[PDB]
């Protein structure tokens, strides 16, 4: 049957109370298998399934470096959106990003998505054609222009078509084997 691999990204902002706790969660099909949590005594990627515990030790360090890098940019973005909306300097905010590609039983890509969200409301998302964007408000209109000038649509498209499906095939091989 058609399988899927998706990631959830949460960047909840707390002003003065601390730093924005940032966490990534990875779902293969519907079963979570890895998670990063910023609020920990020593944070790093952790497996959430015995078949994911088989993956090598370079995997966990290579991803943690990437995960920490995504935290630093989203920490800036929470500040960046406040300049777009004219939000109070001290207020709680949340950015949610879902990214994933689902493939049919043939191993061929059926659909791939990436949907940014702000304070429980939609912001921007990659289209069905995987080359264009749909901005939700005037602030996302500004973000859409920055990604078109930066060629961001192609980096995300290549990730969805190539890296996501290849990695889904490797992940499913470990789950079926164990």
């Amino acid at each position: 049957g058609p399988h899927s691999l998706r990631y959830f990204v949460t960047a909840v902002s707390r002003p003065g109370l601390g730093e924005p706790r940032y966490m990534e969660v990875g779902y293969v099909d519907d079963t979570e298998f890895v998670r990063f949590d910023s609020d920990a005594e020593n944070p790093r990627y952790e497996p959430r399934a015995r078949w994911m515990e088989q993956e090598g030790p370079e995997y966990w360090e290579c991803e943690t470096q990437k995960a920490k890098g995504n935290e630093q940019s989203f920490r800036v973005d929470l500040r960046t959106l406040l300049g777009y909306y004219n939000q109070s300097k001290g207020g709680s905010h949340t950015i949610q990003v879902i990214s994933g590609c689902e493939v049919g039983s043939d191993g061929r890509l059926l659909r791939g998505y990436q949907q940014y969200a702000y304070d429980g409301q939609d912001y921007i998302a990659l289209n069905e054609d995987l080359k264009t964007w749909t901005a939700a408000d005037m602030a996302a209109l500004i973000t859409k222009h920055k990604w078109e000038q930066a060629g961001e649509a192609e980096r995300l498209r290549a990730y969805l078509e190539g890296t996501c499906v290849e990695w889904l095939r490797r992940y499913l091989k470990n789950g079926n084997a164990t």
Binding site: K131, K146, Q149, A150, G151, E152, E154, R155, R157, A158, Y159, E161, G162, T163
Partner: protein, 237 residues
């Protein structure tokens, strides 16, 4: 200014190896290589930021790129195949997320046999007398055939001056045989212009053939990069 890419036209035999260079804008730290096939849609290969990797997309294990201390990036192609025949672009943003500037792009075509490479044969056919009499707009068809591969750029030159107004060139070269192509383009001109015997017309065809590094099997002239033209004066009647 602008970001430089070189070389822009290379013929490499199957199972060969070549390197593509890209000199980004001065001060720009983020460089990114883009593969675009002769079909359509843009493939993201790999992006480098400050002499280190950042995200890897479609770049096969056969290709290896690196950023130097001059921030200029080289793409090293090993064990080339025919599927690698495409055009390769190099964008160079200042930082990651900032506006990227594409290079000229370099055209790579992998041939099965280097001996099949052959320059075109151009010819210029004057407009039919019935066309200038009825339509009163003459048309100069130009037929360049027999070349391989299609590293061709056809242009029209009147009175020693390159012209673009009123010319119509086929967008994609029609492939006649497995190892020989053909491209055509017609320039429409008014009857008063074409009838003047003092106006020089010329249809030149640029052809980017083999490089000097590739050895040429003797017994034949080497199909080097060269442009051949077919000219025709105006004729009053």
């Amino acid at each position: 200014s602008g970001v430089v890419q070189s070389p822009r036209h290379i013929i490499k035999e199957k199972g060969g190896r070549s390197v593509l260079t890209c000199i980004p804008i001065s001060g720009h730290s983020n460089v990114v290589w883009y593969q675009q096939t002769l079909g359509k849609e843009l493939k993201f290969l790999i992006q480098h930021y400050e002499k280190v990797e950042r995200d890897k997309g479609f770049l096969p294990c056969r290709f290896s790129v690196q950023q130097f201390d001059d921030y200029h990036s080289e793409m090293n192609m090993s064990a080339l195949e025919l599927e690698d025949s495409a055009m390769y672009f190099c964008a160079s943003s200042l930082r990651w997320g900032d506006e990227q500037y594409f290079g000229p792009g370099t055209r790579l075509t992998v041939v099965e046999d280097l001996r099949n490479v052959t320059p075109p044969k151009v010819s210029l056919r004057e407009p039919s007398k019935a066309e200038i009499a009825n339509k009163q707009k003459a048309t100069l068809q130009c037929q360049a055939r027999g070349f391989f591969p299609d590293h061709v750029e056809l242009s029209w030159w009147v009175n020693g001056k390159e012209v673009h107004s009123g010319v119509s060139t086929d967008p994609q070269a029609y492939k006649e045989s497995n190892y020989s192509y053909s491209l055509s383009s017609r320039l429409r001109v008014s009857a008063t212009f074409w009838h003047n015997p003092r106006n020089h017309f010329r249809c030149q065809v640029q052809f980017h053939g083999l490089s000097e590094e590739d050895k040429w099997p003797e017994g034949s002239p080497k199909p080097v990069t060269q442009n051949i033209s077919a000219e025709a004066w105006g004729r009053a009647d």
